[PDB]
Amino acid sequence: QYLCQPLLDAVLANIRSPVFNHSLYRTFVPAMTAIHGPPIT
């Protein structure tokens, strides 16, 4: 609604890509699983 257009523009640029699920993984995975906590038991 306000200052979210990088997140909106990333997914439309990365759509129709076969590496989509891996490009998002590569750019995103270490950020949330490190500080906020490990995965569940």
Partner 1 sequence: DPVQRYKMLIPQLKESLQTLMKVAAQNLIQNTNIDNGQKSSDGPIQRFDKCLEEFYALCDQLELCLRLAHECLSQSCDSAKHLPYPQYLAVIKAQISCAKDIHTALLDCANKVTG
Partner 2 sequence: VSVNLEAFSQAISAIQALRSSVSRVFDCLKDGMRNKETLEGREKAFIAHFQDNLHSVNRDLNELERLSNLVGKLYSQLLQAYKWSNKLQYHAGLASGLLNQQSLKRSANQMLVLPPQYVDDVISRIDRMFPEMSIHLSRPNGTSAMLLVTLGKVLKVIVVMRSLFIDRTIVKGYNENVYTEDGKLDIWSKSNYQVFQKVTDHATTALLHYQLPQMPDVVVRSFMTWLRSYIKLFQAPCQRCGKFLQDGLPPTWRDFRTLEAFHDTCR
Partner 3 sequence: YCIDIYCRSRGVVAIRDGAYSLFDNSKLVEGFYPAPGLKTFLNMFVSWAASIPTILTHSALNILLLPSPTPYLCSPLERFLGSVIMRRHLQRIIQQEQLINSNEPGVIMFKTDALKCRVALSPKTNQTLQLKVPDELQVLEKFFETRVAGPPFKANTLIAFTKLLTHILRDCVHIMKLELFPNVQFCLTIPPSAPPIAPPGTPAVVLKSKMLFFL
Binding mask 1-40 for partner 2 (x = CB under 8 A): xx-x--xx--x---------x--xx--xx-xx---x----
Radius of gyration, alpha carbons of the chain: 13
For partner 1, which residue of 31, 37, 40, 41 counts as binding (CB under 8 A)?
Answer: 31
From partner 2, partner 1, partner 3, none, interface partner of 41 (C-beta below 5 to 8 A by class):
partner 3
**Quick one: three-class SS letters along 1-41?**
CCCCHHHHHHHHHCCCCCCHHHHHHHHHHHHHHHHCCCCCC
Residues touching partner 2, count (CB under 8 A)? 14
